[PDB]
């Protein structure tokens with residue numbers, strides 16, 4: 001399991017949590033020096049538990065699929081919640097079995113479905129460590145509209161930060177003040193599968209992507225990523241979705 005406490009949290013303790021989260025995901029291989037997540041894992045071992053504590057010390061446990069960093073569901077006191085999707089239903093076979101009741105949220109874990117439930121795109125939802133404290137608190141008691149927004153915050157501040165060092169840094173900058181995500185942040189989230197695929201296809205193509213990946217940069221400018229020498233590959237991306245899962 002990995003853990004993160006909002007009480008006393010600072011850029012450093014958050015950085016230690018995102019490092020723990022990355023290090024909890026198993027890999028047998030690196031591709032271009034980036035850990036390659038596994039094609040699959042059997043049974044309970046497929047799921048990492050993240051224990052998150054709001055500023056007051058209340059906690060949820062979030063179940064994450066270690067092959068793709070997808071949040072499947074979470075436990076809040078004696079109630080479990082899972083996304084309305086087959087992979088989460090399968091997860092519910094393995095985690096939080098001791099919950100007194102299981103609620104299936106009325107959406108899947110897809111960014112578009114979450115944004116429609118929440119009533120807003122994530123361009124307009126501030127993220128940061130204060131927003132994560134709020135998200136944890138919201139998820140403590142069921143409210144499906146409020147929870148969609150909380151889950152947009154939670155997914156970006158945990159999974160997306162584990163995946164991209166830039167997103168981790170964006171959150172550290174927002175340790176004491178929320179702010180909506182930069183265009184670059186949104187771009188990276190949206191390209192993770194694409195990037196993962198192109199970095200693995202590069203392995204037999206002299207480091208060159210079969211198909212260029214288009215991103216937005218730090219100044220809000222649209223750039224083409226064509227090969228493994230790009231800073232996005234050498235510095236930013238920390239985990240690769242296995243092409244078997246693409």
Ligand SMILES: C[n+]1cn([C@@H]2O[C@H](COP(=O)(O)OP(=O)(O)O)[C@@H](O)[C@H]2O)c2nc(N)[nH]c(=O)c21
Nearest residue numbers: 070071072083085109110111112155159189190
């Ligand atoms: C396809 N899918 C992607 N995710 C992840 O959940 C978040 C939003 O899902 P998405 O809109 O599919 O992501 P993307 O367009 O950025 O790839 C991102 O972290 C995705 O990696 C997903 N998460 C869940 N729980 N279930 C899914 O089917 C699923």
Ligand SMILES: *[C@@H]1O[C@H](CO)[C@@H](O)[C@H](O)[C@H]1NC(C)=O
Nearest residue numbers: 208225226227228229230231
């Ligand atoms: C590879 O990527 C770098 C940009 O990161 C660029 O300077 C170079 O022109 C690209 N070359 C090829 C052959 O794709």
